[PDB]
Ligand SMILES: NC(=O)C1=CN([C@@H]2O[C@H](COP(=O)(O)OP(=O)(O)OC[C@H]3O[C@@H](n4cnc5c(N)ncnc54)[C@H](OP(=O)(O)O)[C@@H]3O)[C@@H](O)[C@H]2O)C=CC1
């Protein structure tokens with residue numbers, strides 16, 4: 001099993017979601033960026049694993065459920081089996097990560113991507129160890145009901161560039177955004 005990573009798109013006021021949707025209108029290339037970063041795996045013969053909470057899973061349109069080319073794990077304590085189209089179900093983030101080291105997955109998983117929501121981000125980010133945050137900064141305020149947790153910059157170093165990540169400002173539908181990578185190791 002390779003690195004542990006979070007990936008998120010967040011508005012200036014730290015919003016990630018509103019009523020099960022994005023706070024902003026669809027940004028097609030931002031979605032393509034999310035698809036590319038979580039799907040691309042260098043290690044031959046393996047796939048990355050995506051971890052998400054239940055509400056994040058049901059936010060994805062059925063057309064894109066499961067996220068293709070990746071192993072899909074859903075976090076829930078109420079569900080008794082993985083939702084339709086999902087691959088795995090765990091009752092805690094710790095259980096999910098431990099599962100990646102079981103023989104069932106031991107040599108199939110390259111990178112692990114936490115793709116939401118807020119509680120899963122928070123726990124991963126505040127758990128000691130080596131972690132990266134791939135953060136798309138939507139550079140406008142958007143009305144939201146779900147927020148990304150605080151990034152402790154004493155711990156998380158903003159990297160000055162990163163291979164495969166555009167450093168310049170993007171713009172879709174009149175909305176400017178930029179890609180960032182943070183890294184901690186504690
Ligand atoms: N902009 C972006 O980058 C992203 C946007 N989104 C949006 O963000 C919002 C997400 O809302 P949020 O409430 O954060 O959704 P979550 O994906 O966090 O769903 C939360 C549910 O997942 C389960 N769950 C969460 N953490 C754990 C855990 N550690 N162990 C076990 N079960 C767990 C619980 O389900 P139960 O009650 O069944 O136990 C909980 O009720 C949505 O609007 C979504 O559309 C989603 C992802 C990223």
Ligand SMILES: CCc1nc(N)nc(N)c1OCCCOc1ccccc1/C=C1\CCOC1=O
Nearest residue numbers: 007008009021022030031034059060064115136
């Ligand atoms: C592209 C958004 C994004 N961006 C970055 N940087 N990180 C993320 N973790 C992320 O969320 C991906 C899972 C959440 O997904 C959705 C959430 C709300 C509404 C729709 C979707 C899924 C869609 C819309 C386009 O087609 C899909 O599959």
